[PDB]
Structures are given as C-alpha cells and as structure tokens.
C-alpha cells in the first residue's frame, strides 16, 4: 500500500513538470484556438 | 470639429462614420491617418 501510494504521488507530481516544461504538451487545444483565429483572420483579410 | 459624438466625417477625403475621442498615439509628422490590425482606419489627424 505505501509503495503504491508513493508511486502514485510521484507520478502525479511529475505530471506538473511534464506539462509545464514541455511547451508542445497542449498542442491540440492551442490548435483549435489557432484554427479559429486563422479562419477569422482570413475572413477579415478577404475584405481587401 | 464635433468630438465625443457619433457623427459622419470627411477628413481630406477620408470619409467615415464614428466617434472621435482624441487618441494620444504617436504619429510621425508626415503620417496623416492610422490603421488597426484589420486595415480599418482607427485614427486620423485634423488638417486644421
């Protein structure tokens, strides 16, 4: 029980470092945001 | 010059509609009117 709890706690703590250090970790959500922004920017620039 | 009110205006040929509210900005002496990121004129200079 103690070893399993310690392993889980260590893995959970490493989750924070894995997300924070890696800038590409959340690429899917940022890709959604960037697709929306790019579509809107294309729509705007089509006015010229 | 009608300030702070929604009016139609014609500055030197730049015709438009909106509210003029004395932007601070930093126009280079030769620069007549400004533009936002969407290529819409968001600032003008009074020719008077």
């Amino acid at each position: 029980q103690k070893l399993i709890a310690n392993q889980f706690n260590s893995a959970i703590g490493k989750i924070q470092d894995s997300l924070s250090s890696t800038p590409s970790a959340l690429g899917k959500l940022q890709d959604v945001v960037n697709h929306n922004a790019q579509a809107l920017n294309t729509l705007v620039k089509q006015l010229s | 010059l009608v300030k702070n009110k929604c009016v139609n205006f014609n500055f030197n040929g730049l015709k438009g509609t909106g509210v003029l509210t004395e932007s601070n900005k930093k126009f280079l002496p030769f620069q007549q009117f400004g533009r936002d990121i969407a290529d819409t004129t968001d600032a003008v200079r009074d020719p008077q």
């Binding site: 997300l19 924070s20 970790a25 959340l26 959500l29 940022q30 945001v33 809107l40 729509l43 705007v44 006015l47 | 936002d36 990121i37 969407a38 819409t40 968001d42």
Partner: peptide, 27 residues
C-alpha cells in the same frame, strides 16, 4: 495558464459569444 485584435474583428461584424457554462461551473 498554458493556453485589440478582438475589437478590430468586432468592428467588421465578427463577434464571439460566451459559452453557456463558465470556467467556474466546469471546474
């Protein structure tokens, strides 16, 4: 934390509607 243009787009008729559920409600 890991994730003037808005006004410029709004002045051309393109606006963004808020989601029905706030971030606090999703939390």
């Amino acid at each position: 934390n890991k994730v003037d243009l808005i006004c410029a787009q709004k002045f051309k008729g393109l606006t963004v509607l808020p989601p029905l559920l706030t971030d606090e409600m999703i939390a």
